[PDB]
Design a protein around this motif. Structure first.
Motif, PDB file in Angstrom:
ATOM      1  N   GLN A   1       0.829  -1.196   0.000  1.00 46.65           N
ATOM      2  CA  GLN A   1       0.000   0.000   0.000  1.00 46.65           C
ATOM      3  C   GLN A   1       0.867   1.251   0.000  1.00 46.65           C
ATOM      4  OE1 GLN A   1      -2.201   0.723   3.566  1.00 46.65           O
ATOM      5  NE2 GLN A   1      -2.921   2.690   2.770  1.00 46.65           N
TER       6      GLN A   1
ATOM      7  N   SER B   1     -10.582   6.610   4.317  1.00 48.21           N
ATOM      8  CA  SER B   1     -10.595   5.140   4.501  1.00 48.21           C
ATOM      9  C   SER B   1     -10.264   4.459   3.175  1.00 48.21           C
ATOM     10  CB  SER B   1     -11.924   4.681   5.023  1.00 48.21           C
ATOM     11  OG  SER B   1     -11.874   3.309   5.378  1.00 48.21           O
ATOM     12  N   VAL B   2      -9.359   3.485   3.199  1.00 50.45           N
ATOM     13  CA  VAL B   2      -8.996   2.736   1.964  1.00 50.45           C
ATOM     14  C   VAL B   2      -9.417   1.280   2.162  1.00 50.45           C
ATOM     15  CG1 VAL B   2      -7.100   2.043   0.432  1.00 50.45           C
ATOM     16  CG2 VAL B   2      -7.081   4.316   1.470  1.00 50.45           C
ATOM     17  N   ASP B   3     -10.207   0.737   1.238  1.00 43.82           N
ATOM     18  CA  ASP B   3     -10.711  -0.654   1.356  1.00 43.82           C
ATOM     19  C   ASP B   3     -10.599  -1.304  -0.020  1.00 43.82           C
ATOM     20  OD1 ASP B   3     -11.770  -2.739   3.034  1.00 43.82           O
ATOM     21  OD2 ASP B   3     -13.708  -2.448   2.037  1.00 43.82           O
TER      22      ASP B   3
ATOM     23  N   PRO C   1     -10.200  -3.857  -2.944  1.00 43.90           N
ATOM     24  CA  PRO C   1     -10.464  -5.293  -3.081  1.00 43.90           C
ATOM     25  C   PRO C   1      -9.205  -6.047  -3.482  1.00 43.90           C
ATOM     26  CG  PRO C   1     -12.068  -3.966  -4.290  1.00 43.90           C
ATOM     27  CD  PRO C   1     -10.928  -3.071  -3.950  1.00 43.90           C
TER      28      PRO C   1
END
Lengths: 215, 116, 239, 239
Positions: A67, A74-76, A78
């Motif tokens: 990353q 917020s980082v989500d 996939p």
């Protein structure tokens, strides 16, 4: 037990030949490697014990991601999917992440998603000649090139679109000759390799030295 | 027939070249070698025998005397220098011998030109 | 005993009991398009003079016979060809001379350049019938397109003492004076262009320098005789 | 029907039912020293243009093929040689053209000179591949070294109508357009020097002049094709 000194047991070992990184927010975030056996000195020296070689290619790719800094609250992201395209000699070659070459049907490609077993592909002996040549005393003019040794190019890119944060991925290419046949033994390389493209060398001593002929 | 009459310790190589009639004489060792030739090693053999071929205008017999006609030549060249040990003379001599080899014949007896 | 061998219109003499080294246990043979038998003759190149300070000589094969009769004529005529060779090396020395020679035929003897960034030019890589000489010193890097001719690396960045892996014969003056190497056709393709690729390189390197006492001949001639074997080229007619 | 004949790397087409005239009932054969089969090919010389005022053409045989490939090469290489010939003469004319040609091969066609005291020079006696033309007028005596090319004497002081004694074929445009003469080797010696002696002379003389109406092609090309047969030369090696 002389079995471990056979040509197959001597050359059939997987080795990391190339290492590269590519991010997913650059337009240029793609890794390329022209397949050649002169990248690694240890493998080059072992292959240069012979003049003519014939082998298949087994490639294993170890891809990992990291990353990158972002400002998103917020980082989500996939799971990431990667494309590894093999371009046969003479095939179209990409220059951007978004390029037609990535969709050429005659350029075999592997789509692999992170978390699974690493992808693996095999390329056979693809030379119009009857064997690869590690040494060529002639001109194609450039001395000692022998364009009959072209083995293709490999390309790698992210398939997923960029999310709320950049992702940088690194790919390790593992190279393994299979069903190797070798001809015309040659003296082991003695001088240090100077250039990847030629056999140029700087003269060095025949061996290490002692004080006197009677030790 | 050529006989080398140097010392037994002398060694060297000679190129004996035969030029057929019509063809010119060689001007170099290379030109001689490219034609009909024999490499003569005096270190191995003291004598060399060559039988030059007839080759005539389908005439079977040809004139003993001649007039500005294709002649055919035999020449010798230094392939290598003469190698000699210490206390051995480098300067030597060669003897040449001639004779009829194949089915030789003559015709029309005449007077010899050597008598007054 | 002396054995006389005649090939075409040329004849040479060899010691009857001379030992012949077959390259890789394989004799020259025909491709299992157009052959030529008028090329089947001995080509005696110019003799070189082995001296005390001699470092070595080498000849690239196809090129050495590029200006010799029909073989050269066939080389410029046909675009493609293949052939084997039989190489005779003979020294004329007396029993008062001492020295040891290595006579080796190296397939695909690709050579480095003095300048690490460039490659040697054709003139420095081969002199045709003329021999190319190794050097007991190291060629400076300032030089732009010359071969790194340091003998102990044999111009290939390898140990010169390891050249015996290639078909070879030793010439020890006290024991023998001639060498005969039979080299088959070795290539990655069945046929190749003879003008742009030197398949073979013959090397003669003095491992023990020539020595003699005052009065003896200060040189030892070395004669190379090459006879192409089973040569064949591409056809030039229609079907 | 059309028959295609291929010789070496050359091929020509002839009417299947064309009549071949064998010179003297004898086909070319080998001497009952060194033969050459790469010469066995068709040599198509430059075509000549048969016109209304044409008097005739001739070619000396060995000389005509002196600048053609290996045959010429063999001519300068070897000092002595012998060969037969097969001569094809073909005219390209329409059914609206009329004319008659005599195609004759004369052995030892020694020719006279315009000046009675001299002899013709080599250039006037032969033009190599180029054809030599007869003349319907009489060459003046002032001329010093030219051939007396008056057609009705055929340059030999004989009746031109009597040339049929030599192997010959008539070409009558209304009936046929090609001629084929097979000439054996004819000489007083088994072999001879090809550069100083012309064994054969091919002659083409229009007995009936070419005629046509306005609008038709004002010329009729004549093509000569010569194929040496059973050629052999002297050896160049030792015994």
């Amino acid at each position: 037990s002389r079995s471990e000194s056979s040509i197959e047991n001597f050359l059939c070992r997987a080795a990391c030949v190339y290492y590269a990184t590519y991010t997913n927010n650059s337009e240029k975030g793609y890794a390329e490697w022209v397949i050649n056996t002169r990248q690694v000195a240890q493998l080059r020296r072992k292959l240069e014990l012979f003049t003519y070689l014939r082998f298949d290619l087994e490639l294993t790719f170890v891809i990992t991601s990291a990353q990158q800094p972002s400002t998103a609250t917020s980082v989500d992201a996939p799971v990431q999917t990667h494309q590894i395209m093999y371009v046969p000699p003479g095939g179209p070659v990409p220059t951007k992440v978004t390029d037609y070459a990535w969709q050429t049907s005659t350029n075999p490609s592997v789509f692999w998603t992170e978390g699974n077993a690493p992808p693996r592909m095999s390329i056979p002996f693809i030379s119009i000649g009857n064997a690869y040549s590690c040494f060529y005393d002639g001109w194609t003019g450039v001395y000692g090139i022998n364009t009959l040794n072209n083995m293709g190019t490999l390309y790698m890119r992210h398939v997923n679109e960029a999310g709320q944060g950049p992702i940088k991925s690194t790919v390790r290419i593992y190279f393994k000759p299979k069903h190797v046949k070798a001809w015309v033994p040659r003296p082991p390389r003695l001088c240090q390799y100077e250039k990847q493209k030629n056999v140029n060398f700087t003269p060095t001593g025949v061996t290490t030295t002692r004080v006197g002929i009677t030790t | 027939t050529f006989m080398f009459c140097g010392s037994a310790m002398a060694t060297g190589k000679f190129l004996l070249a035969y030029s057929p009639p019509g063809a010119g004489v060689p001007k170099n060792r290379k030109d001689a070698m490219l034609g009909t030739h024999v490499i003569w090693d005096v270190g191995l053999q003291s004598s060399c025998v060559l039988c030059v071929p007839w080759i005539s205008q389908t005439h079977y017999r040809y004139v003993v005397e001649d007039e500005y006609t294709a002649a055919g030549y035999i020449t010798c060249w230094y392939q290598t220098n003469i190698v000699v040990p210490a206390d051995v003379q480098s300067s030597c001599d060669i003897l040449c011998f001639v004779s009829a080899c194949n089915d030789f014949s003559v015709r029309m007896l005449k007077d010899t030109p050597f008598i007054r | 005993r002396v054995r006389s061998i005649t090939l075409g219109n040329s004849t040479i003499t060899t010691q009857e009991c001379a030992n012949v080294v077959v390259g890789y246990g394989v004799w020259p043979e025909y491709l299992k398009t157009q052959p030529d038998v008028a090329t089947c003759r001995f080509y005696t190149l110019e003799s070189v003079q082995w001296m005390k300070n001699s470092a070595g000589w080498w000849w690239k094969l196809p090129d050495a016979l590029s200006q010799m009769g029909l073989f050269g004529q066939n080389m410029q005529y046909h675009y493609l060809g293949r052939t084997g060779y039989t190489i005779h090396v003979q020294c004329n020395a007396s029993k008062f001379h001492q020295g040891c020679l290595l006579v080796v035929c190296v397939p695909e003897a690709e050579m480095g350049c003095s300048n690490l960034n460039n490659t040697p030019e054709f003139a420095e890589l081969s002199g045709g019938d003329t021999a190319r000489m190794f050097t007991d010193t190291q060629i400076g890097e300032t030089n732009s397109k010359k071969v790194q001719t340091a003998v102990w690396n044999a111009g290939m960045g390898v140990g010169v003492g390891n050249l015996t892996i290639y078909p070879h014969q030793w010439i020890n003056l006290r024991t023998n004076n001639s060498a005969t190497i039979v080299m088959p056709y070795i290539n990655s393709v069945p046929m190749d262009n003879m003008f742009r690729h030197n398949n073979l390189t013959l090397m003669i390197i003095p491992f023990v320098p020539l020595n003699y006492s005052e009065g003896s001949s200060p040189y030892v001639p070395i004669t190379v005789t090459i006879a192409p074997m089973c040569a064949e080229y591409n056809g030039l007619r229609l079907a």
